[PDB]
Amino acid sequence: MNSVTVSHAPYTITYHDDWEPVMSQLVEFYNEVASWLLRDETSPIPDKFFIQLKQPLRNKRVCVCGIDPYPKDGTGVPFESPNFTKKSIKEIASSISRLTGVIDYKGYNLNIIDGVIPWNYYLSCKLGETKSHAIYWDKISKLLLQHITKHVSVLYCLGKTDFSNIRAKLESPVTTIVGYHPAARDRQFEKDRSFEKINELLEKDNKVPINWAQGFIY
């Protein structure tokens, strides 16, 4: 790990070596825009905005990406709900239960799966207001997702409206699946074959599949 100083809260960013190439730009861009982020109470809190930068990238094959943190109770870990109450993670767990045949579990966390990096495209929102910080994160969000997609083989984005033009934010032709959000009407996430397709796409690329059952909390 390594640390660098910013001129605004949270003052210090700690990062895994694999993120070094973006850190100079990140510090510059965060110093420019952070006053707009810090006007508001946020999800997550400022001290948690950057905790996913402690994750390695060189062992990652899939990025599972949502647009922004939970509007309340974000932890800094995308999708994480320690008490297993947020609808998104319960719906994801239900999909994985059907795919894997694991019926008995207590929770689910995308951040304990080998080869998967869960991601929030925007790293904060004003508390209670989805997508409220989009304009502020936009340059950082592009910088970070382009860095991720130098490493992963498949990008899976959740939310058709929010990610329809995600290609335009990238600099490579990385394999990208854009599926329904867990809260899409007519229970369209339930029927979505996106999780299953990821391992088909990895196998076609001669990459080891994801063991989705690793996310269960027993």
Question: Which are the catalytic amino acids?
Answer: 68
Contacts of 101 (CB under 8 A, 6+ apart): none
Angle at 151 between CA 48 and CA 131, to 5 degrees: 40
Residue owning tokens 């895994």:
16
How far apart (Å, rounded) are the C-alpha atoms in residues 100 and 151? 26
DSSP code, position 18: G
User: What are the DSSP E strand ranges found in 67-217?
Assistant: 107-108, 116-120, 125-126, 154-158, 175-179, 216-217
Burial tier of 149 (Cβ tally within 10 Å: 0-12, 13-18, 19+): buried
Instruction: Confirm if 67 and 162 have CB atoms less than 8 A apart.
Output: yes
Enclosing H/E stretch for 62: strand 62-66
- Longest alpha-carbon distance in the chain: 49
Partner residues linked to 66 by β-bridges: 120
